[PDB]
């Protein structure tokens, strides 16, 4: 098994939580690229790009908070 | 007035694929009602089309299992306003099915 | 060895041939095999009118 | 079930509120194109096109505002 | 939840201070999405959406400030 | 009890209680005009109600936006 | 009133710096609301509302500046 | 061989492979029009092509900017 710590477990919870978004985004992009002027494709792309943006933000903000909590404990071993 | 009408249409697509390989077949075609003249009505037409998407699996019992998406029908055409063509090209529906069968 | 850990097993799906790859000890492989064949069964067909 | 976020829901509310507008607006055009000089056709089409316009506008602005309310909270985790 | 901290309490003061806004925005949207072109409904929804924005925003800034007020205190225990 | 209502709701509703019944008057004027579009006195009556209604909705929504922008700028300085 | 700090003093100096704007703006609001089509009432409102906006913005930035000076000094007690 | 290209370049290039020929069509439409700038059949065509070109460019740039901001916001957390 590839060794995984705790941080990469917290990080993975988001990845499996948003089951298929990662691919839905590129699918929507390839349709939009096939016909930029269609409003039904536009209005569908907006919602996916926004969901993706928020997902990535929350993910990394959480990883950072945990690393700060652990470093503050390890500082007290000495 | 008294009127009687009967109609029949049969269509059959064939697609070659390999075990575990997904495959798709897609077709569209048009037909023209030959109501004819120079003092004519505009030549009406109807268009029919089909999707198949499939994924096959061999089972040791000598059975084939398929995941199936099927889409079929003909294009909605309010523009075919004519009464004179009561000999319309036959109105099939529009249908979607998705399922698995063995 | 007979006392190897359950967490060492690895399973990799291989759809190209509809098969599985399993890595472990002999006894672990054996148990996995038994579980696999305890899990997969030919589903029944149902028709709805 | 299929994976969908909260922005997807807010978006789909409109699509399920306008039951059939997306088709009617197309058929109206198809008829009009056959005889542009009919005033009844023109009159109908005008109202349909206008309704489709407003529907797309409201749908987009709302999604934007919920994206901003989310981003503001995410920023404060740290 | 059974256990509730100080920051929990301060957060909850807003949730109980706005009696049911969380519902009023949901059902106002349900009404508007059904008829996107009614000015009476648009004029209602603008207000309820704005109020919901200012509420969610100030709740989060306040919790952030109270966290930092005392993260600075427990730093002096050592 | 009565439903909860913020400050912006109140600044909005001061119009809906200021223009006493314009929202009914406009629908009455339209229902009368649609009966006989070629009456000069009906067209002359409807033009005024429609214009007043337009202005009323503009002033209402612009004022709500301005207050929402004065509030967000204070809330941002809490941090 | 019972207790006030230096920041409270800085703030209050605006609240008394403008004598009556706090009422004038609410007064003009309902004069207009009674007759939203009067040009004189509109022009009267536009300037009072602009002055109220600038009054609140100018008030808040100053209080923040002073908070940052005081926090900077207190940081050096240790 | 071929020059190095990043993820943002792959995104920008998707649109260009999507609109197979628009870049040429927009030029030749203009030269037909400018040769006889008073034919309604040429004008109606050019209106369409120029609109399509506008929307294309404008969507491409906004998408690239959003992906930039996502990455800069992740990198800001390494420290």
From Swiss-Prot, chain B:
Source superkingdom: Bacteria
User: What is this protein's function?
Assistant: Component of the type III secretion system (T3SS), also called injectisome, which is used to inject bacterial effector proteins into eukaryotic host cells. Forms a ring-shaped multimeric structure with an apparent central pore in the outer membrane.
Q: Which gene encodes it?
A: sctC1
UniProt lineage: Bacteria, Pseudomonadati, Pseudomonadota, Gammaproteobacteria, Enterobacterales
Q: How does it assemble?
A: The core secretion machinery of the T3SS is composed of approximately 20 different proteins, including cytoplasmic components, a base, an export apparatus and a needle. This subunit is part of the base, which anchors the injectisome in the bacterial cell envelope. Forms a stable homooligomeric complex. The complex is composed of 15 subunits.
Where in or outside the cell is it found? Answer: Cell outer membrane
Describe which stretch of the whole protein the shown chain covers, with first residue, last residue and complete length: 359 to 460 of 562
State what protein this is by name: SPI-1 type 3 secretion system secretin
Briefly explain the null phenotype. Insertion mutants are hypoinvasive in the HEp-2 cell assay.
Provide the species name: Salmonella typhimurium (strain LT2 / SGSC1412 / ATCC 700720)
Family statement drawn from the similarity comment of this UniProt entry: Belongs to the bacterial secretin family. T3SS SctC subfamily.
UniProtKB/Swiss-Prot annotation, chains F, H:
| Reported effect, residue 52 to A | Exhibits constitutive secretion of substrates. Retains the ability to display SipD/SctA at the tip of the needle filament. Does not yield assembled filaments in vitro
Outcome of mutating residue 54 to A, per the record?
A: Exhibits constitutive secretion of substrates. Retains the ability to display SipD/SctA at the tip of the needle filament
Q: So what does mutating residue 25 to A actually do?
A: Non-invasive phenotype
Gene Ontology cellular component terms for the protein in this record: cell surface; extracellular region; type III protein secretion system complex
Documented effect of changing residue 78 to A: Abrogates host cell invasion and effector secretion
Q: Give the matching InterPro entries.
A: T3SS_needle-like, T3SS_needle-like_sf, T3SS_needle_YscF
Pfam families to which the protein is assigned, alphabetical? T3SS_needle_F
Picking any one GO molecular function of the record gives: identical protein binding
Q: What is the effect of changing residue 77 to A?
A: Exhibits constitutive secretion of substrates. Retains the ability to display SipD/SctA at the tip of the needle filament
Upon changing residue 9 to A, the result is:
Exhibits constitutive secretion of substrates. Retains the ability to display SipD/SctA at the tip of the needle filament
KO phenotype (gene knockout): The null mutant strain is non-invasive.
UniProtKB keywords: Protein transport, Secreted, Transport, Virulence
Supply the induction statement. Negatively regulated by PhoP-PhoQ.
The annotated modulation of its activity is:
Binding of bile salts, including deoxycholate, to the PrgI:SipD interface may inhibit the T3SS function.
Tell me the outcome of changing residue 76 to A: Shows a specific deficiency in the secretion of the translocase SipB/SctE. Shows fully assembled needle complexes. Is able to invade cultured epithelial cells
Which Gene Ontology BP terms does the record give?
protein secretion by the type III secretion system
Q: Where does it localize? A: Secreted; Cell surface
- Mutation effect (residue 55 to A): Exhibits constitutive secretion of substrates. Does not display SipD/SctA at the tip of the needle filament. Is non-invasive. Can polymerize into filaments in vitro
Outcome of swapping residue 8 to A: Can only secrete early substrates such as InvJ/ScpT, PrgJ/SctI and PrgI/SctF. Can polymerize into filaments in vitro, but not in vivo. Cannot enter cultured epithelial cells
Record comment regarding domains: Deletion of the last five residues prevents self-association and yields monomeric proteins that allow biophysical studies. Forms a right-handed helical assembly with roughly 11 subunits per two turns. The location of the negatively charged surfaces are radically different among the needle filament proteins PrgI, BsaL and MxiH. In PrgI, the major negatively charged surface is not on the 'face' but instead is on the 'side' of the two-helix bundle, and only residues from helix alpha1 contribute to this negative region.
- Give the similarity note: Belongs to the SctF family.
Other facts: The levels of PrgI/SctF are reduced in an invA/sctV mutant, probably due to protein instability, and are increased in an invJ/sctP mutant.
Q: What name does the UniProt record give this protein? A: SPI-1 type 3 secretion system needle filament protein
UniProt organism field: Salmonella typhimurium (strain LT2 / SGSC1412 / ATCC 700720)
Q: Which gene encodes it?
A: sctF1
């Amino acid at each position: 098994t590839p060794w995984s710590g705790y941080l990469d477990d917290v990080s993975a919870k988001f990845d499996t939580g948003v089951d298929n978004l990662q691919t839905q985004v590129t699918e929507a992009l390839d349709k939009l690229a096939a016909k930029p002027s269609d409003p039904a494709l536009l209005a569908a792309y907006q919602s996916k790009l926004s969901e993706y943006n928020l997902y990535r933000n929350a993910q990394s903000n959480t990883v950072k908070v945990f690393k700060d909590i652990d470093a503050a404990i390890i500082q007290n071993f000495r | 007035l008294e009127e009687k009408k009967q109609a029949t249409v049969v269509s059959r697509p064939v697609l070659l694929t390999q075990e575990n390989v997904p495959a798709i077949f897609d077709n569209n075609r048009t037909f023209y009602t030959k109501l004819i003249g120079e003092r004519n009505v505009a030549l009406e037409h109807v268009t029919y089309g089909t999707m198949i998407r499939v994924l096959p699996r061999f089972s040791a019992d000598g059975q084939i299992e398929m995941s199936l998406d099927i889409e079929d029908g003909n294009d909605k055409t309010p523009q075919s306003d004519t009464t004179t063509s009561v000999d319309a090209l036959p109105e099939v529906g529009r249908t979607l099915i998705s399922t698995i069968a063995r | 060895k007979q006392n190897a850990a359950a967490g060492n097993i690895k399973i990799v799906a291989y759809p190209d041939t509809n098969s599985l790859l399993v890595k472990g000890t002999a006894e672990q492989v054996h148990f996995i095999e038994m579980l696999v064949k305890a899990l997969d069964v030919a589903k029944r067909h149902v028709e709805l009118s």
